[PDB]
Structures are given as C-alpha cells and as structure tokens.
Amino acid sequence: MISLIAALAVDRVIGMENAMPWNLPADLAWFKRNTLNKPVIMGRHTWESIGRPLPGRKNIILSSQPGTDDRVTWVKSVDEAIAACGDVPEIMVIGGGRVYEQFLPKAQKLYLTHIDAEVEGDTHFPDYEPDDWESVFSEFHDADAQNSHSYCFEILERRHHH
Ligand SMILES: Nc1nc2c(c(=O)[nH]1)N[C@@H](CNc1ccc(C(=O)N[C@@H](CCC(=O)O)C(=O)O)cc1)CN2
Ligand SMILES: [Cl-]
Ligand SMILES: [Cl-]
Ligand SMILES: [Cl-]
Ligand SMILES: [Mg+2]
Ligand SMILES: [Mg+2]
Ligand SMILES: [Mg+2]
Ligand SMILES: [Mg+2]
C-alpha cells in the first residue's frame, strides 16, 4: 500500500523541511515513527534538501535523470519507484509537491500534520476530495518551549476514488 506523509501550513503550503518556517521536533518525531523501517520515495529537490539518506529506511529518489549518489536508489517513474520497493506492507511518499501530486491517486492512506502557521511559500500539497477519505486518528498539540506552533496530527484512510 502507498501512503503520503506531509506537513501542511495554512493554505496547504508545504516545502522542504530544512527551510520551513516552523520548528516542530514533535512533528519530526511523528515523521520518523511513521516512516521507520519502510521505504521512502521522494523527488530530487526533497532529496537534495535532506542531503543524507534517512536512516533505517530505503531511500528511493524519483528523478528523470541518472542518479548522482550511490547511497540511494534512483528511479525514473512512479511505476519504477513502486517496483523498487518490492514486497513491503507500506510505502511512504515524502514529497515534494509534484511527487505528492503524482502519487496521490495510488495512495490509500494519508499522514498529515496540520500546522497553525501562515507562511510565504508557493508549493502546495495536492488537492484531495475530503469526501473520499475517513479520518481515523487526530490529535491536537499546542505549541511549547520546543515546538514553535500548534499542530494537529491526522491519519486518513481512503474510502472512495475519483
Ligand atoms: N510530518 C512531516 N512530513 C513531512 C515533512 C515534515 O517536516 N513533517 N517534510 C517533508 C519531508 N522532509 C523531511 C526532511 C528531513 C527529515 C528528518 O530529518 N527526519 C528525521 C527526524 C529528525 C531528527 O530528530 O533528527 C528522521 O530520521 O526522520 C524529515 C522529513 C515532507 N513530509
Ligand atoms: Cl509521534
Ligand atoms: Cl521533490
Ligand atoms: Cl513548555
Ligand atoms: Mg551508481
Ligand atoms: Mg499539485
Ligand atoms: Mg490535482
Ligand atoms: Mg462515503
């Protein structure tokens, strides 16, 4: 099964973790917990922004060009990315914008962090029809000395497809 995992500011703005305007170690812990021991698929912009393979996960980079780093697995299409994951229970797509857009139709689960921040970025999470999904978990957390903004984790499971 394919899942997307994303952190969304107001207006469903996303960007690279290393440059986003919030500081949420709690969200990074959520991301790690929900991706550990699963393959992660990302585009090249996200890969370059991380710069080092995420530990304890197979890192698959979706790029139309030949790879530039032997520490990760380079693939040229959505289908090839999925094939490279082999037989695993759950494949995690970690962005960015265009990669989420291409994988959303193949996804059956979303892990979202709804962050109470308004920001300047121009990359967005894909449009999804909320009527097609069921919320099976949600937890709000206020900001604290370690986390700059309040945020709400959510897991959604797909019920319909258009
Ligand atoms: N929900 C959540 N989803 C996301 C992001 C996020 O921001 N949070 N941002 C994008 C993914 N980018 C990264 C980049 C780096 C890390 C990262 O570095 N993670 C460490 C945890 C951080 C740490 O404590 O060292 C890890 O091992 O997973 C996580 C997501 C897309 N989806
Ligand atoms: Cl968590
Ligand atoms: Cl990307
Ligand atoms: Cl505190
Ligand atoms: Mg090589
Ligand atoms: Mg889009
Ligand atoms: Mg769309
Ligand atoms: Mg229904």
Domains and CATH numbers, the chain: 1-162 (3.40.430.10)
Q: Which of 14, 17, 152 to mutate to test the pocket of ligand 1 (most atoms within 8 A of CB)?
A: 17
Cα 53 to middle of ligand 2, angstroms: 21
Asked, as a colleague might, if the bond just before 96 is cis with ω within 30 of 0, I would say yes
State which approach was used to obtain the coordinates.
Answer: X-ray
Q: Is 9 exposed, middle or buried (0-12, 13-18, 19+ CB in 10 A)?
A: buried
What would the 3-class secondary structure string for 118-153 be?
CCCCCEECCCCCHHHEEEEEEEEECCCCCCCCCEEE
C-alpha neighbours within 13 Å on the C-beta side of residue 96: 20
Site residues for ligand 1, CB cut-off 6 Å:
5-7, 17, 27-28, 30-32, 46, 50, 54-55, 94-95, 113
